Design a protein around this ligand. Structure first.
Ligand SMILES: Nc1ncnc2c1ncn2[C@@H]1O[C@H](COP(=O)(O)OP(=O)(O)OP(=O)(O)O)[C@@H](O)[C@H]1O
Ligand SMILES: Nc1ncnc2c1ncn2[C@@H]1O[C@H](COP(=O)(O)OP(=O)(O)OP(=O)(O)O)[C@@H](O)[C@H]1O
Ligand SMILES: [Mg+2]
Lengths: 166, 370, 174, 333, 367, 131, 296
């Protein structure tokens, strides 16, 4: 099982890299802006760490002083799971105001990308969110598996109720 | 295919309206409720079916509360069921239309658009305000007999009433005064003056409207048996709303005073037009000899505002142009005007098709036009 | 508003006493007022209608005697209707007489609210005048009610006239 | 073993800012407003608040000897509050021209001037101008080239430290001509001029603060790379005699200091105060102050800046710490 | 002591004061006194027809202004109208008839023995300690600008921009309406103004603005209306002040706040630009937005090194565009006048006191 | 490069491109023995990219072809520099899971994080700008 | 609901309400059903004469015989529009015990009744072929191959839809067409049509007909049709009708069950999509609750 080692590794690296501090943009005055979107910010950004357990799934763990980013590529082999996760991430990022953390336009080449700032780290605990990330990932995986398993029942029921009428 | 007959559906509390354009009577009417109950978790009645199967409907809760959509998981089910098993309509054949109470929030409007667009994979969405939909129905009268979006929409419901003026089509909800008094007040009044189903049957069978009780009583001494006697209750019923003190002294502010305050709160420049013509929404405050009663009350209350102001200020203001027009059948007139508004060739020039959504998402779902 | 206005009192001249004024009318018993110029419309007849219309009202703007007399008439009519609501004609007339031509002195008795009855009390210089006026007015109103409400039956008044006496002026019914 | 719990303070503390007698502490609330409390039976209580600020206040300080209070924010300027004899706190502004927002402020030992952590490429210092009511401005462009994060004032009117953003640890000096304080010579620099620099110590990453032994020598500093470094300079042109870099295994820390002449204590992101000895030819970690390492530890959040205790200038054997969720604690040893 | 008659609002305070004392707007009501004034016209404006006599540097309600000044001298100052002196200043480039009428009034109505009518821009520039320079006086309705040199402003370089706070608020409400909401132009003109200065900040980054607005949520905020409804504002917070830099968007063909300033600067000789470059400041609407100094500095640098003659950035440090950002830019001219009136008080060389009160001859130019 | 980066130009040894090959050869010939040579010298951050990629691939292959019976022995028997270097190497090798399996890499990362400390990951995160 | 109704609920309710009512009022409604059709329920002149209101393809083929034989003399002028009007009166009824319900059901199923005429000729041809190849089982293949490609008819009930049918020996097969305008709907239809053919393996339902699938490789015999050829956004499914199901004893229910095959699939797909949306909303609510609880 290569799932628990990867989960432990991502949890540990996230807990180690989660360090948000207040910083004023040295370019523009009296406007707190990010450090991964505006300008370049060469001497502030850290090395983007990445962890992977397979070829179709990975997560880019980027770090900064006040612009830490995080993204994961959900596993997908068939078109069913592909379109399922596509629609799920679309509907989840559409109403980004609910969580106040998710983004609207994820980075190119990825499915979903989160976003955390100093305010988000102070309004909530650290280990709580660290565990909630893994819990949400596992719950999304299980829900996708169920939906894949939930369509067969409806399909066979429709088949049996449409062929038994005669 | 961009030319078929559109569909108008004004879903709200209690009874929900739904049908087609180019008509005068509703095709279906029933209360908004579903008889919700391993697998096969989709067997639940709707409308009259649920009202009859309540025996085993297992707590047929209501899916709508205070007009605003609160249970989307059940609202979508109700919508799809009413569209498939009670309308037999093809979604990929013509345009659609949704309902939204006054001041509907962008969040809820976008949620409704997204749940009614991607779920059924339709093509064409359109949402408007109840005020404009009700005002467009009064165009059939000989007063306007044209397109003139200027006036006020006083929605008097069964539970509560409200008013939402419109300034040249744009409803300005900055100053509004709602009247909690509704049909329930008159129902309780009638029930108390005779010491649910029987009360409603007695209230929806005979209801007079008199200028004043002092004259109603004088004319009464100079009557009907159904269902068990009647009397001055028919004369006192309507006054319960005109003079709240008769029914409930809590909201002493009467209807004429509320209308005057609402029309005077806005700038006078636009109020001079708003006070010209007004239309009532729904068919609750539609009693025999009712509209003219409110017109007389307003033209009598405006005395101390016009005649006295002319002498106080010293300027002849010939603003005698108020003329209230009452609908003939407003019980389901919320879509009567919508049908005429959608039958215009330019109805499709202010909508969004699949090409305007597939490459834009749920962003363009709030800004509309006439 | 739907209240019953006085339409008789003014601010020019009237035989007021304490907190109310005088209203000459036609009556059989002794009265303090004098004969009016014409009997086209007496005040005792309009008071009955005012009370019948205001029985289901909240209150009325007390403006001198115009409102005090109307409130007194409405209260008297309500009391008469409650005492002869569904009783025999003989007992009803007996109670009406015992309430109109009784020994009731000037207003200001205990138990009942003194503010709603008569705010400014003026017993001296008008005691007998006010007493005889009240007696005559009560007798006339009681007789007029017994003659009008009484239908063609064997002294049976209108059912609604006695069944619509649930409320009173200012909620002074229970 | 030893612990203490005060007002939960459901706001980002980031500071302690004790008073002269250490009875009226001030703390920020991520807003222009300020929260002040007074001593009460087994706890504090709300006493007064400050206003007139535009953006969130970041750093404040109060010299115990003078009983003054100075504040700064990201509003292009800083304010100073004075104790009014009527029973309140006065407010006064200082005229200083800057290009970016400030991040940190530190008072002077002898209470004659102060430094501000300007986010621009220059550092400013102000003082009381004679025959005037406002405080003159100041700026330096030669030594510094990037923004600064932390600041520290050596026990003197010279050799003002400065924590630059880059991996280098810069150090400046402020010697005003009007100020009669003579710049006595030391090991850092003899007869140093107005503007000068001692050495740019390359750190193992970021920098959060700089330490100072109670005597004055044995400079130190920490960073985000979970490591602390010391220094023993012998001359402004010679290299350090002993440059030992110890890397702790736990999470990094910030806002270090020198508890004793040899022992050093500090805290930060890690949920446990560290305790280690110090020598000129040796170094090693002994243990942590926590005795329990939802969570087993006491502080279940990030630790904020750490200030020392009154004690004695030579040794204090005590300090106080807090976090982003308040819950200030007054440790010992 | 003195005051500053403004178009929209007006201030008043003692001379050499640390901060202003009174602040009242030029919006008189009409119904509680006979005619609302200041507080009586603002707090009770719900049942009174408001009116703004001062507008566009001119006036139309003479009795209204008279009552305003009477109430001011009565309550706001608590000093005798004739046993005291004042020093006012109208907007720049104003007509001479208004000044003559103000002098005649101050002389023959209140009995003032000594007054003074100077230029507000001159006082705003002197408050910062500078005798020669420029000032961006973005008024409430018109943004007037004029240079200063040798204690006198150059009338040739005088101008006025069509942009102002009114157009800004109009575009803000229009964007809030077209964004999905259904508001009115006059439904609530105070909540929009309170939200603008509270959540809007000018930024000269158009490529990054929409990017951060459509790719992040940190820009989103939560504002509370007066009734209780929770309203949201997104990318419409930074686009509001953009109308100042793009007059064409408000329906007025104009170069811009920076383009016009440049065209006026390089319009004069090079001998004055050397000192005018190090005096680029603003006092009013053009000095209160967040991020305006950096934006205008970048615009000036761009139009400097890419407008006249430049092919490479080999001499970008030769020209220094000094753009000072005074925190008290709103009361800059007020403080300047308050500090200047004290130097001319004891001075007996002012040909106004004892001459512009009752001793009026046939010449009134030296005023 | 100019700031926040200690090494700037090391053409003296970078242009040679021989020490890395010599170290990789001994490790390959030997393949608790790999880390001795593979970690004795880290790829010097410079303008050389092919040699660095080859050394990284060789180190990843050596780590994969190692005895995974009792890793704790070598995990505990190593200096701070060695553990930091191997952690950084594992982090840089886990970026391309197509060529390598990454399972052994993730296992070694988890073991060194749960056996040594919870600060090695944070220390390796702040590495050189181009090294 | 697991089976779509074949009778219009609106008409089935209006007729049964007007038959028992005693105050018929004016009606000016315009109801539309599936397959792109429109109805017109209104009275031309009087208030009681209820005048209830792709077609040329069936007119040129011949379908009015069965409609007339089933409806009697209730036909009326073409009434330009739907092209099939009917005159009904609520005063000259023959009885009210069950004739009212029968007439209501007939007027409601008029759609299928009109769309069921092409099946009578197919039934007749199949019976004739079975009678021809009854005593001589041999020689049937070539005769059947020669008795096709000429009698098969194509129905055009939509701008893009198309259904064809041709007779066989001892059985009869049909084929449908569909046009999916989305990838998720395409995948749903694919999995549904796969489960359909996979379900027949069960012995309890082995007696059901055989169903095949063809996405991009349509039958070569039907490829000669002038309709749409093989396409990427198209899917054809073939069915078979045996004699046991095609027997006249039970030939009235199978036709109505098959006439709603194109809509049942889309209805079930949309129901599944609604269930997916509901589950997603539930998960989002759970995540929001967890996030709100994460606060201190
Ligand atoms: N002619 C009439 N005169 C008086 N009352 C009537 C008349 N017609 C209907 N009503 C009553 O008016 C009330 C409101 O009817 P209406 O159809 O307007 O409700 P509604 O707006 O759909 O209600 P809700 O807002 O609760 O959904 C009901 O009690 C109804 O029976
Ligand atoms: N917080 C704020 N930030 C920026 N602008 C603001 C703020 N509050 C108000 N404003 C705008 O400031 C303008 C008025 O500025 P001010 O009162 O200084 O003008 P003024 O000096 O009276 O003008 P004039 O010289 O034209 O008479 C209006 O556009 C107003 O909406
Ligand atoms: Mg309604």
């Amino acid at each position: 099982n290569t799932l628990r080692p990867y989960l432990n590794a991502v949890r540990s690296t996230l807990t180690a890299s989660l360090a948000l501090e207040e910083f004023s943009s040295e370019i523009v005055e009296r406007q707190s802006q990010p450090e991964v979107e505006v300008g370049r910010s060469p001497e502030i950004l850290l090395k983007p760490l990445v962890v992977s357990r397979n070829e179709q799934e990975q997560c880019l763990i980027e770090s900064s002083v006040n612009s830490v980013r995080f993204s994961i590529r959900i596993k997908q082999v068939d078109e069913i799971e592909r379109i399922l996760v596509r629609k799920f991430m679309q509907f989840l990022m559409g109403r980004a105001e609910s969580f106040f953390i998710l983004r609207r336009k994820p980075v190119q080449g990825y499915d979903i990308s989160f976003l955390i700032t100093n305010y988000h780290t102070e309004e909530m605990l650290k280990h709580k969110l660290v565990d909630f990330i893994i819990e949400f990932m596992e719950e999304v995986d299980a829900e996708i598996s169920e939906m894949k398993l939930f369509l067969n029942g409806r399909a066979r029921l429709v088949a049996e109720t449409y062929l038994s009428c005669f | 295919a961009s030319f078929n007959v559109p569909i108008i559906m004004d879903n709200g509390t209690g009874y929900s309206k739904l049908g087609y354009a180019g008509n005068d009577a509703p095709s279906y009417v029933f209360p908004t409720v579903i008889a919700t109950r391993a697998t096969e978790d989709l067997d639940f009645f709707i409308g009259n079916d649920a009202l009859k199967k309540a025996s085993a409907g297992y707590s047929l809760d209501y899916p709508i509360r205070h007009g605003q959509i609160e249970n989307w998981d059940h609202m979508e089910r109700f919508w799809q069921q009413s569209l498939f098993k009670y309308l037999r309509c093809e979604p990929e054949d013509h345009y659609f239309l949704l309902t939204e109470p006054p001041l509907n929030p962008p969040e809820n409007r976008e949620n409704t658009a997204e749940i009614m667009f991607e779920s059924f994979n339709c093509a064409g969405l359109y949402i408007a305000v109840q005020a404009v939909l009700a005002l467009a129905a009064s165009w059939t009268s000989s007063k306007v007999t044209d397109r003139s979006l200027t006036g006020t929409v006083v929605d008097s419901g069964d539970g509560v009433t409200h008013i939402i003026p419109v300034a040249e089509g744009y409803v300005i909800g900055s100053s509004i005064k709602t009247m909690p008094l509704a049909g329930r007040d008159v129902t309780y009044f009638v029930q108390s003056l005779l010491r649910l189903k029987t009360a409603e049957r007695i209230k929806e069978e005979c209801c007079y409207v008199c200028p004043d009780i002092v004259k109603e009583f004088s004319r009464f001494d100079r009557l009907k048996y159904a269902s068990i006697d009647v009397g001055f209750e028919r004369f006192l019923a309507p006054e319960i709303f005109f003079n709240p003190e008769i029914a409930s002294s809590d909201f002493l502010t009467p209807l004429p005073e509320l209308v005057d305050n609402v029309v005077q709160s806005s700038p006078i420049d636009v109020r001079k037009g708003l006070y010209k013509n007004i239309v009532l929404s729904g068919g609750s405050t539609l009693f025999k000899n009712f509209g003219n009663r409110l017109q007389r009350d307003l033209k009598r209350i405006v005395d101390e505002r016009i005649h006295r102001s002319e002498m106080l200020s010293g300027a002849k203001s010939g603003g005698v142009d108020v003329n209230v027009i009452s609908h003939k059948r407003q019980r389901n007139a919320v879509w009567f005007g919508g049908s005429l508004l959608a039958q215009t060739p330019e109805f499709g020039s202010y909508c969004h098709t699949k090409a305007d959504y597939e490459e834009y998402g749920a962003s363009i779902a709030r800004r509309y036009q006439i | 508003m739907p209240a019953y206005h006085s339409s008789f009192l003014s601010l020019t001249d009237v035989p007021t006493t304490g907190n109310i004024a005088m209203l000459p009318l036609k009556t059989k018993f002794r009265g303090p007022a004098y004969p009016a110029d014409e009997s086209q419309m007496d005040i005792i007849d309009e008071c009955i209608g005012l009370f019948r219309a205001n029985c289901f009202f909240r209150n009325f703007e007390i403006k001198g005697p115009a409102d005090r007399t109307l409130i007194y008439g409405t209260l008297f009519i309500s009391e008469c209707l409650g005492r002869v609501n569904g009783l025999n004609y003989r007992d009803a007339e007996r109670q009406l007489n015992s309430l109109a031509l009784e020994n009731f002195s000037i207003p200001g008795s205990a138990g009942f609210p003194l503010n709603a009855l008569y705010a400014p009390p003026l017993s001296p210089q008008d005691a007998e005048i006010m007493r005889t006026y009240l007696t005559q007015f009560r007798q006339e109103l009681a007789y007029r009610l017994l003659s009008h409400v009484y239908a063609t039956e064997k002294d049976h008044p209108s059912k609604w006239w006695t069944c619509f006496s649930k409320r009173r002026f200012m909620n002074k019914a229970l | 073993a030893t612990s203490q719990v005060l007002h939960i303070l459901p706001k980002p503390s980031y500071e302690h800012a004790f008073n002269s007698q250490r009875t009226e502490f001030v703390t920020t609330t991520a807003t222009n407003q300020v929260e002040l409390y007074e001593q009460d039976g087994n706890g504090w209580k709300h006493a007064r608040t400050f206003s007139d600020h535009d953006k969130i206040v970041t750093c404040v300080d109060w010299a115990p000897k003078s009983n003054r209070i100075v504040t700064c924010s990201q509003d292009r300027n800083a304010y100073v509050y004075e104790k009014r004899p009527d029973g309140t706190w006065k407010q006064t502004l200082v005229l200083l021209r800057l290009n970016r927002a400030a991040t940190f402020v530190r008072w002077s030992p002898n209470e004659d001037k102060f430094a501000v952590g300007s986010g621009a490429r220059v550092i400013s210092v102000c003082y009381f101008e004679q025959e005037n009511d406002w405080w003159v401005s100041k700026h330096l462009k030669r030594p510094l080239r990037s923004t600064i994060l932390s600041l520290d004032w050596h026990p003197n009117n010279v050799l003002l430290a400065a924590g630059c953003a880059d991996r280098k640890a810069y150090v400046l000096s402020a010697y005003v001509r009007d100020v009669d304080a003579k710049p006595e010579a030391s090991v850092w620099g003899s007869r140093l001029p107005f503007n000068t620099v001692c050495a740019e110590y390359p750190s193992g990453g970021w920098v959060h603060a700089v330490g100072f032994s109670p005597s004055g020598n044995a400079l130190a500093y920490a960073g985000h790379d979970s490591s602390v470094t010391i220094a023993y300079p012998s001359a402004p042109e010679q290299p350090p005699r002993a440059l030992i870099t110890v890397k702790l295994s736990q999470l990094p820390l910030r806002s270090l200091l020198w508890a004793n002449e040899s022992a050093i204590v500090a805290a930060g992101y890690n949920y446990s105060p560290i305790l280690l000895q110090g020598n000129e030819s040796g170094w090693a970690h002994t243990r942590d102050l926590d005795a329990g390492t939802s969570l087993p530890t006491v502080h279940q959040n990030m630790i904020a800046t750490l200030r020392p205790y009154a004690g004695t200038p030579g040794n204090i054997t005590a300090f106080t710490s807090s976090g982003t969720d308040g819950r200030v604690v007054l440790w010992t040893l | 002591i003195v005051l500053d008659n403004g178009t929209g609002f007006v201030k008043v305070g003692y001379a050499k004061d640390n901060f202003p004392r009174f602040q009242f707007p030029s919006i008189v009501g009409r119904p509680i006194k006979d005619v609302m004034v200041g507080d009586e016209a603002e707090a009770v404006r719900s049942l009174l027809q408001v009116k703004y006599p001062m507008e566009n540097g001119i006036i139309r309600d003479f009795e209204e202004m008279n009552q305003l000044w009477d109430y001011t001298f009565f309550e706001k100052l608590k000093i005798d109208p004739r046993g005291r002196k004042i020093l006012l200043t109208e907007p720049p480039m104003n007509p001479v008839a208004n000044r003559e009428k103000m002098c005649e009034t101050m002389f023959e109505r209140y009995g003032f023995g000594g007054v003074y009518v100077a230029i507000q821009a001159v006082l705003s520039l002197y408050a910062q300690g500078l005798s020669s320079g420029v000032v961006v006086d973005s008024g409430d309705g018109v943004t007037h600008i004029v240079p200063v040199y040798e204690s006198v402003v150059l009338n040739h370089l005088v101008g006025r921009l069509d942009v102002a706070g009114r157009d800004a608020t109009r575009y803000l409400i229009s964007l809030l309406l077209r964004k999905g909401y259904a508001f009115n132009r006059t439904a609530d003109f105070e909540t929009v103004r309170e939200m603008k200065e509270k959540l809007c900040y000018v930024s000269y980054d158009l490529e990054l603005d929409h990017k951060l607005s459509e790719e992040t949520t940190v820009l989103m905020r939560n504002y509370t209306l007066p009734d209780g409804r929770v309203i949201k504002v997104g990318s419409e917070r930074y686009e509001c002040p953009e109308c100042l830099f793009q007059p064409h968007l408000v329906g007025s063909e104009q170069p811009g706040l920076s383009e016009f300033i440049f065209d006026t600067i390089q319009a004069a000789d090079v001998d004055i630009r050397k000192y005018l470059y190090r005096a680029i400041v603003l006092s009013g609407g053009s000095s209160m937005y967040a991020g305006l100094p950096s934006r205008l500095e970048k615009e000036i640098k761009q139009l400097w090194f890419e407008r006249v003659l430049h092919g490479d950035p080999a001499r970008l440090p030769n020209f220094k565009v000094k753009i000072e950002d005074a925190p008290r830019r709103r009361h800059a001219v007020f403080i300047g006048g308050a500090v200047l009136a004290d130097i001319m008080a004891q001075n007996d060389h002012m040909w106004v006191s004892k001459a512009e009160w009752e001793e009026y001859g046939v010449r009134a130019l030296d005023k | 490069t100019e700031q926040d980066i200690f090494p700037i130009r090391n053409e003296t040894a970078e242009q040679v491109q021989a020490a890395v090959s010599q170290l990789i050869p001994q490790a390959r010939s030997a393949i608790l023995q790999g880390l001795k040579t593979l970690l004795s010298y880290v790829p010097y951050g410079n303008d050389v990219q092919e040699v660095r990629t080859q050394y990284l691939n060789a180190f990843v292959d050596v780590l994969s072809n190692i005895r995974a019976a009792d890793i704790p022995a070598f995990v505990k028997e190593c200096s701070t520099e060695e553990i930091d270097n191997i952690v950084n190497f594992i982090y840089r090798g886990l970026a391309n899971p197509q060529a390598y399996n990454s399972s052994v890499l993730l296992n070694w990362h988890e073991k060194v994080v749960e056996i040594s400390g919870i600060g090695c990951i944070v220390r390796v995160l702040n590495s050189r700008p181009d090294l | 609901m697991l089976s779509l109704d074949y009778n219009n609920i609106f008409i089935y309710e209006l007729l049964t309400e007007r038959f028992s009512s005693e105050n018929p009022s004016s009606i000016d409604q315009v109801v539309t059903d599936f397959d792109g059709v429109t109805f017109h329920i209104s009275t031309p002149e009087e208030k009681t004469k209820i005048l209830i209101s792709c077609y040329p393809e069936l007119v040129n083929y011949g379908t009015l015989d069965l409609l007339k034989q089933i409806y009697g003399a209730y036909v009326h002028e073409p009434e330009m529009g739907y092209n099939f009007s009917i005159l009904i009166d609520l005063q000259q009824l023959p009885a009210t015990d069950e004739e009212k319900e029968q007439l209501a059901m007939s007027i409601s199923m008029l759609k299928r009744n009109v769309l069921a005429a092409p099946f009578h000729r197919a039934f007749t041809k199949q019976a004739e072929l079975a009678d021809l190849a009854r005593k001589d089982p041999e020689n049937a293949p070539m005769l059947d191959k020669q008795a096709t490609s000429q009698e098969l008819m194509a129905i055009h009930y939509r701008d893009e839809e198309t259904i064809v049918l041709w007779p066989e020996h001892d059985r009869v097969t049909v084929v449908f067409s569909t046009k999916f305008r989305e990838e998720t709907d395409r995948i749903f239809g694919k999995v549904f049509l796969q489960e359909f053919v996979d379900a027949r393996r069960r012995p309890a339902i082995q007696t059901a007909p055989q169903v095949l699938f063809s996405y991009r490789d349509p039958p070569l015999e039907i490829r000669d049709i002038q309709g749409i050829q093989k396409g990427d956004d198209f899917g054809f499914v073939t069915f078979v009708l045996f004699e046991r199901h095609f027997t006249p004893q039970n030939r009235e229910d199978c036709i109505s069950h098959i006439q709603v095959f194109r809509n049942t699939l889309h209805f079930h797909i949309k129901a599944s999509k609604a269930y997916m949306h509901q589950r997603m909303r539930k998960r989002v609510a759970d995540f929001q609750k967890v996030l709100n609880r994460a606060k201190p």
